[PDB]
Amino acid sequence: MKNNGGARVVVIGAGFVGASYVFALMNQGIADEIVLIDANESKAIGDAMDFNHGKVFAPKPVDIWDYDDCRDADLVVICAGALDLVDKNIAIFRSIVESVMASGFQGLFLVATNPVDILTYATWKFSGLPHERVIGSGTILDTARFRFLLGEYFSVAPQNVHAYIIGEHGDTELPVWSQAYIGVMPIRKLVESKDLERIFVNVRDAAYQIIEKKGATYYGIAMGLARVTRAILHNENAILTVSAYLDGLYGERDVYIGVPAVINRNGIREVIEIELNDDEKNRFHHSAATLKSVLARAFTR
Amino acid sequence: MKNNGGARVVVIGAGFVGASYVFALMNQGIADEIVLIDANESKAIGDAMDFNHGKVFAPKPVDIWDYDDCRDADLVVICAGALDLVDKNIAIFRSIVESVMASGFQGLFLVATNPVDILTYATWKFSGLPHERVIGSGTILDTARFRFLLGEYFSVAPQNVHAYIIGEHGDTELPVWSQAYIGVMPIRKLVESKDLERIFVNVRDAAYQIIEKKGATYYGIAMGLARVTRAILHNENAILTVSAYLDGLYGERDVYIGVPAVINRNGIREVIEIELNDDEKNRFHHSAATLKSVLARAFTR
Amino acid sequence: MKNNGGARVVVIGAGFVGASYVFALMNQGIADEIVLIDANESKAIGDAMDFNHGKVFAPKPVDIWDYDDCRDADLVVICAGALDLVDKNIAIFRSIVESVMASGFQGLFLVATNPVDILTYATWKFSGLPHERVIGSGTILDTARFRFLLGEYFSVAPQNVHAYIIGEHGDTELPVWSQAYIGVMPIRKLVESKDLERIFVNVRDAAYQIIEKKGATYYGIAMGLARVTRAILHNENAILTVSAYLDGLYGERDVYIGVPAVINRNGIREVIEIELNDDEKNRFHHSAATLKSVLARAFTR
Amino acid sequence: MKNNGGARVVVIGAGFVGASYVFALMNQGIADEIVLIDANESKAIGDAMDFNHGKVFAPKPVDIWDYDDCRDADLVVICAGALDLVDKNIAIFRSIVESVMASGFQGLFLVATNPVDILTYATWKFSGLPHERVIGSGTILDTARFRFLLGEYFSVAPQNVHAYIIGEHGDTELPVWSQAYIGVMPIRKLVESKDLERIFVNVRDAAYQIIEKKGATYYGIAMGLARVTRAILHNENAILTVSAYLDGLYGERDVYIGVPAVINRNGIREVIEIELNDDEKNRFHHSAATLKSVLARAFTR
Numbered sequence A, B, C, D: 001m002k003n004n005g006g007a008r009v010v011v012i013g014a015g016f017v018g019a020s021y022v023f024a025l026m027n028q029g030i031a032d033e034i035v036l037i038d039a040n041e042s043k044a045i046g047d048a049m050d051f052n053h054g055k056v057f058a059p060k061p062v063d064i065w066d067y068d069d070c071r072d073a074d075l076v077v078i079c080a081g082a083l084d085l086v087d088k089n090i091a092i093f094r095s096i097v098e099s100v101m102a103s104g105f106q107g108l109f110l111v112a113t114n115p116v117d118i119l120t121y122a123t124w125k126f127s128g129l130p131h132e133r134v135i136g137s138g139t140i141l142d143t144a145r146f147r148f149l150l151g152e153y154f155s156v157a158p159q160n161v162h163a164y165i166i167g168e169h170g171d172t173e174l175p176v177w178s179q180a181y182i183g184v185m186p187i188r189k190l191v192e193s194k195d196l197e198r199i200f201v202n203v204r205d206a207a208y209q210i211i212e213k214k215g216a217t218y219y220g221i222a223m224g225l226a227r228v229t230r231a232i233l234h235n236e237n238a239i240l241t242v243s244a245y246l247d248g249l250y251g252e253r254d255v256y257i258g259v260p261a262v263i264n265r266n267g268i269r270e271v272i273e274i275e276l277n278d279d280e281k282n283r284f285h286h287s288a289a290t291l292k293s294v295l296a297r298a299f300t301r
Ligand SMILES: NC(=O)c1ccc[n+]([C@@H]2O[C@H](COP(=O)([O-])OP(=O)(O)OC[C@H]3O[C@@H](n4cnc5c(N)ncnc54)[C@H](O)[C@@H]3O)[C@@H](O)[C@H]2O)c1
Pocket: A012, A013, A014, A015, A016, A017, A018, A037, A038, A039, A040, A043, A079, A080, A081, A082, A092, A096, A112, A113, A114, A115, A116, A137, A138, A141, A169, A216, A217, A218, A221
């Protein structure tokens, strides 16, 4: 035919998060063609140069730098960004989707911009798209930060820690302690459990503390953001803690929010209802409610 | 025993080049333990946090943030940096080596700081170390940029292009056209050869052009810098175009300079003398001479 | 120095299991140097040829084909093999260890030969070695077969299934249902639980059924056998269900047996006592007792 | 939609070569879905079991075990096999293609069965398919065996050796010495060149010698066979020495034969005419002629 390309990824916003994500992909042999778009076209040119000179050294991807690329483009990751935030980004966002949509996009969205659950909701309303194809970054990094600290604690690997952070990827989020294991051993390894509400405070004050000695978080997210990518593209059917549309599940009804979902090559398969505890349902409820608010408050632009 | 670690890497300088290198390693499953040092300790703390939260998502490395780490530390990559440059960095450098040396280091150095061939020479004089264990970054990125453009041209993969950039990683460097193939087909695919002195001008004005729309090159080098790393650590016995000490080979005698060398787990094995052409010997000679100059000019501090 | 090699692996027995293991390693970029030994030296020559011609295509290992290789050899995997079995192999085995031991080995053993828990015990008695450095293959494949069927069932990935098979890697083994999750959701997704005692019967009759249409299992084990390898060599601190020496834990006292252990670059770190249920303690007890028997029964040779 | 799968591979013949190829893929994270077909359905069941139990340990592929799978099946690798050979396999083959063709296949063929150039020609005649979509295994392993021995010799890595074996993957093949480098240094490192006609005799008597201490070659080919796979599926635009249809190039006209071709996601891009030497054109000519013979001799069935 021509020169094909069955695994394409467009990043809108080639800033710290966008670029480090890209370098993630590439260094990891994940996508096939990677387009890169930025209002700051000159920054895209530079990034894309840079990426193309190291290429040879990695294992084989393509890197290009409008939206006309989003049309047989398997997925679009929006890394672009500014309640006078929620209104700024909604604003920003309102042109991004439209623009990509207006190219006859048929794929998936990966939103990672703050405030994610919200910008994720907005991306859907603006997309038209079914809510199984519009994915938030959500509490993914949170769960990693958590899994890390714990694993760190216990001396095993974060990879044997099984604990989720659910709720608003922000202040309102909560650790599901009731269901948190190391392999199959509950945290019955310590009692009070359900030193550790310590672990979770760091897990939660992490952004602030990283920003404060370095100006920003960007490596972390991209790792997380490259995981979902991997899940989507490879039909993994994996259970990542994303930013999913609540169905009526957890008994919430028109909020996007940080939840275990099953990812694979067609968006989300299904949300999971971990059997949340007493105080969790209340935490979750509060959290979902903090969002469902900003949702009706804001919007407009 | 304790908790071991047979593959350690210390980066002095956790700036753009340092950090992107690190993220390179990690995303690529290359070292085992990665220490990170920076005069700006706060930037190291932040980077190291950031790296540690995404970890779980990659395949298994350790990340820590003095020099006391350089003592069973397999290799030290100096990413730190400012003729009132050559004197600044020599200056900077003069404390780095000493400091790491004073820890009872026994390993290899990877210099990537400009002006590399020079800072590479200086690192040796300051190291004490045999010149087979002090490696410059040298014309590695150049050769990649070259291999890329060509491969790009010919429509094959940079990975089938065989062409070297030798000489000063800078202005004075030269493309070895006389010996430049695509697989085994010389560039006898086009004539004039030994559109293409075009390819090489871009290869050579690349830094300027990338810096100018983005402020700096950092992804490229790290790819290159992660290749050598791979070579060293894995005993590859590979022929990379490094920043090697000229022996009397190419008939030059006390200059570090961009040359094909054979890398593997013990430093450099041996330099290669590609059979350079007439005009090349003259280019090479000029180039080596531009350095051997700055070498006796500068120094002091 | 010479030409080093910090990651070496000797396989005694280059049969189906040995060779497929090797091809596993290599295709997976895991060890650095791989020696291969077999009473049938001619089969080693052939395998090692074969492996060396494809090499170039994989990412960089070395393959050689006595025991004098076991002396700075990081680990030795015994893939060699024939109660007139237990006496045959003990017999076989009794020369293997001795021979490798007599080379001044200082490393770890990976036994995968049936009957593993037993040949694993024997390898220890014969090694001299601390029981944290003599590792059985144990119920690793079992747990995989299990994780697979379940994951298969539930439609997620085996990688989100958390369920262990503990006890004798054989007839007497038991599934720890009481502690078996999908992420963090117990199997409270179905009731009777603690269609599924179906899943576990296949998990347990798998060898017989694979052997019967193909003569043998060899891919499976090597995957499993390459996982532990990965764990050992990379200091993973991972929780694999190995063939560990019971301490007095599970309240058993001089039996090697299939248990969660924490693996990393120095043997086993520590065994875990999952909080086994009523009927499990009884199953476990019976199982451990089936072994502790064959142990005093057999031996001699 | 359903559960997709954009990277599928059907192997007809799940023998030594077929299975080791599969294990290659899987252990290497290359295809996405891998179907496996064999006249000996019971051997497919067993292999596919075996593969599925280790899965979890590798990074994510699917394995299933008629031809109805070849219909959105990206590629079909024929590993199946018996002049009363050429007539047996042609015979065998004549049903394979037909059968897969009769499923509405639209993809590529990878023939690896001996006598390959011939069975590759036959697969085309029987396919209907354009000759850019019917690929022979050809002199790939030969070139590897060659690259290996040399690299072995010179002490560098086979990966820096650039030398091709062209012609019949068999007796009649020839080493293109005239164009054979190490990086960019011709073999002007030794003279007589165009100890070494030694290297090439081993390169050529390798099968016989491996078969004779082990019954067969199967790891080697699968490495090679997994390289092309990688090339096809990832649009590499790489220059592998395949089994291509000669155009009139090398001035030959209706023979499939071992040649440098450029591989990528749509079959072959283009054949290359290395500038073959005097004695080579004569060797090549003889070789091509040995085939063009068996071609008109045989056929029928
Ligand atoms: N979900 C998480 O865990 C998480 C983690 C980290 C950062 N983030 C978010 O990433 C977003 C941006 O991250 P960053 O730190 O890399 O930002 P940044 O300051 O580097 O800016 C990113 C880029 O956005 C591009 N951009 C902005 N508006 C654009 C538009 N209208 N069209 C095209 N390109 C446009 C800019 O030109 C810039 O290059 C923020 O909302 C931030 O919070 C989210």
